[PDB]
Structure formats: C-alpha cells, structure tokens
C-alpha cells in the first residue's frame with residue numbers, strides 16, 4: 001500500500017527533526033538572508049578567525065585547530081546519526097554486530113550528505129549556523145590541510161542542485177544506513193528487506209514532493225557514488241595527516257570507524 | 262508514453278546482440294548450464310592451453326592477454342555507443358570523454374556475465390580460467406582479478422539478462438559527471454530517457470523483483486570503487502614490467 005509508505009516517510013521525517021538540530025531548512029534560511037533566522041559571523045581570514053571567538057560560542061596553530069573542530073563536530077554528528085539510526089523501523093532488531101557494521105560504514109556518507117545542507121559554493125556554516133567559514137579560507141590552509149574540504153564543496157554544489165528538502169533527506173540517509181553490501185555483514189537478507197521498503201518510500205516521496213523532477217530517484221541514487229569516493233579520499237588524506245603531524249590527536253570514535261579496507 | 266521506451270529498449274538489445282559476440286545468455290549456457298570449455302587451473306594446464314592471439318613469465322603474459330581482450334572490447338563498446346540514440350549527435354570531444362571514462366565500468370560489468378564464483382570464461386567461451394589459479398599469481402598479479410570476482414558475485418545476484426544489461430550499459434556511457442565534459446545537458450537528457458527505459462524494462466521483465474532498478478543503480482558505487490582501485494594497481498605494475506615500441510603504443514592504457 002502506498003499509504004503504509006507515506007506513514008513510514010512521515011515517521012522518518014519526524015525522527016529526523018528530533019535527532020538533527022540544524023536542519024537544511026534552518027541552514028538555508030540562514031544562508032539566504034531570511035527573517036526567520038539570524039545572520040552568521042563570517043570567517044574569511046585569520047583576524048576574522050580570531051574575532052570569531054568573541055562572538056561565536058566555541059572551546060578552541062590554526063590549521064590544526066580548525067581540523068580538530070571538524071572532527072569534534074563529526075563526533076557529535078555520529079551521536080545524532082546513531083540516534084536517528086535507532087528510529088529506523090527494524091534497525092534495533094538486527095544482529096548487534098551488524099548494527100555496528102552499518103553505522104561504521106554509513107556514518108561518514110551521511111555526514112557528507114548532511115554537510116551539503118550547510119554549504120553553498122562559497123563556504124559552510126559552522127557552530128550550529130552562528131558562524132560561516134569561506135571556502136577560500138579553507139583552501140588557503142597550510143599545505144596539506146588546504147585541500148581537505150574541497151571534495152566536500154564540489155559534491156555539495158552538485159548535490160544541492162537536486163533541491164532536496166529535509167523530508168526527502170530523511171528517507172535518503174535511512175537508505176544509506178541500511179546497505180546490505182557493507183563488508184562483514186552477518187545477515188544480509190533482513191537488512192535488504194528493510195532497505196527495499198525504505199527505497200519504495202523514498203521513491204514515492206520523490207514523485208509526490210517533486211512531480212516535475214524527472215528521474216530524481218535515479219539521480220539521487222547515483223549520488224551515492226560520489227559519497228563513497230569522498231569518504232575514500234578523506235581516509236587517504238587522514239593517513240597522510242597522521243604521519244606528518246605526529247602531535248595531532250584523532251578521536252577514538254572516529255579512529256574505530258576508520259577500519260576502511 | 263511507455264511505447265517510445267519499448268522502442269529504445271528493443272533497439273538497444275538488438276544493437277547489443279550485434280555488437281557483443283559472446284552474450285550473457287550464451288555464457289550462462291557454457292558456465293553453470295548445459296562444447297565444454299578447456300579449463301585452466303594450474304601452470305601445466307595453462308601451458309597446454311596456449312598450445313591448442315597475443316605473442317616471458319606466466320603472470321605477465323596472463324595480464325597481457327587481459328589487455329588484448331579489453332582492447333578488443335573497447336571497440337565493441339564504441340560501436341555499441343554510436344547506436345545509442347543521440348550519442349553521435351553530441352560534441353565529438355564529449356563522445357571521446359564518455360568512452361574514455363566509461364569503458365572500464367562497462368568492461369567489468371560485462372565481464373561479470375562471463376564469471377561465476379569459481380572462475381571466468383576466456384577466448385570467447387572456449388576456455389575457463391579458474392579463480393583460484395588467478396589468486397595464486399605472483400607479486401600483485403594475483404590481486405588483479407580478485408575484486409572483479411567479488412563484484413561479479415554481487416552483481417550476478419541481480420539475475421539480469423542481456424535485455425536488461427543492454428539498457429544499463431547505455432546508462433553508464435551517458436554519465437554526465439565525467440571530467441572535462443563540454444556540454445553536460447544533452448548527455449543527462451539522453452541518460453534520463455535511458456533510465457526511464459531501464460525502469461520500465463526491469464518492471465516488465467522482473468515484476469517480482471522489488472526495487473531492482475534502485476539496487477542496480479546502487480551497484481554503480483561499487484563499480485567505480487573497483488575501477489578506481491584497479492587503475493591504481495595498474496600503475497604499480499608500470500613499476501614491475503618495465504623497458505615493445507608499437508606494442509606499448511597499441512596498449513596505451515584504456
């Protein structure tokens with residue numbers, strides 16, 4: 001029944017609003033100058049960086065500080081994604097080892113999917129939308145770190161052209177988590193049973209919410225390819241960073257996810 | 262309506278049949294199905310294999326044989342592409358770019374048609390090279406074919422036939438995200454037509470296979486990872502087999 005698929009879509013969106021405090025709708029209102037939401041302080045250079053601590057709530061050399069800010073924010077995102085994952089029907093009923101596997105491989109793909117909501121071609125919201133850091137400033141960071149965000153901006157620019165909203169994205173990230181082709185999965189068939197249902201819900205949602213967007217379903221699914229590539233690029237970059245910066249600490253939670261291979 | 266889509270589907274199937282001599286249906290007959298192929302499972306059966314055409318060490322020669330055949334397949338794939346409605350009307354640089362960045366993904370998709378969990382057909386179905394033997398090869402040559410095997414067991418589980426694959430091959434070719442494309446719009450416009458035709462095709466041909474369309478598109482992400490892993494390995498070998506002239510030229514890299 002298409003009715004059961006609408007109710008699932010409604011459940012996932014409601015749980016997505018409950019788990020993720022900075023939605024695409026809030027991010028867009030900040031980025032475009034709406035009266036619903038307030039204006040970000042903009043970090044584009046070192047003085048603006050230093051000025052931002054006075055005006056922005058934080059708790060933080062500059063490339064190292066910025067990169068560890070991103071990783072602390074990533075750790076928080078893993079907390080939110082993990083709470084969203086529990087709400088996807090059937091997920092908590094799976095083999096515990098496979099719940100862990102799905103999270104291990106799913107979480108960064110979702111992080112970079114949702115990061116696109118906070119991006120435009122010029123930069124990225126930070127500190128829950130209170131701040132905005134320009135793309136050029138990030139590209140100017142010392143040698144290595146200078147390229148760590150550019151693959152995220154490039155994808156975001158193409159991803160944001162799909163014009164998805166949070167109700168669309170709620171189902172999409174659920175589809176991402178419940179991939180039965182993740183390495184090391186014990187019981188693939190129950191996982192695939194859930195994804196099948198999630199894919200039907202996503203498909204119906206895209207037809208009703210975007211009835212003039214031809215093959216949006218297929219074009220969104222093709223984007224899954226870009227996410228995989230961003231993750232494997234990021235992992236390579238992290239292997240370099242940790243060799244050139246022996247004094248820089250990665251969070252153990254992210255360190256346990258990065259099993260790659 | 263759903264009728265122009267059937268035209269597209271049958272047109273592509275027919276051109277696919279003309280363009281690719283060994284189809285999946287025939288490879289299925291040979292493999293796990295009912296002229297049995299000469300099997301290559303060790304060094305002695307390899308040697309007798311060749312004895313009964315490329316031009317030296319065992320592991321190198323097998324890799325060189327894979328190049329010859331893939332260069333053959335690029336020509337089959339190129340001819341098929343020119344049969345996709347609208348492809349020849351695109352910017353010639355863009356046709357070149359779509360083929361350069363697409364033929365690897367298609368080669369490993371069609372190679373899955375010739376594989377099972379235990380080995381791969383070669384020499385137009387006349388031979389079968391066991392997977393275990395390939396994994397047993399020296400240096401990084403034993404790692405060259407293995408990840409295509411793991412893709413192919415996952416791809417083959419979809420149980421696509423040639424009529425399905427004919428439209429999925431075209432979808433891959435018309436990828437609007439290839440680097441360096443000059444005019445992306447008409448490419449995505451064609452691909453959108455192809456995806457529509459692929460979706461109707463799978464719904465009619467596999468009415469019982471829920472969300473087959475989506476599951477097949479998701480296999481793109483594993484294809485590109487395979488291709489990306491492979492071109493890397495391909496570079497490591499540049500630093501194994503070293504200093505051919507016209508031969509080296511013939512096998513540029515694609």
Ligand SMILES: O=C1NC(=O)/C(=C/c2ccc(OCCc3cccs3)cc2)S1
Pocket residue numbers: 066067069070071073074108111115124125126127133238254
């Ligand atoms: O080492 C790593 N591991 C990960 O999973 C990373 C992902 C990531 C998460 C958020 C990002 O936004 C930038 C926001 C901020 C800038 C300065 C203070 S806050 C950028 C990247 S980075």
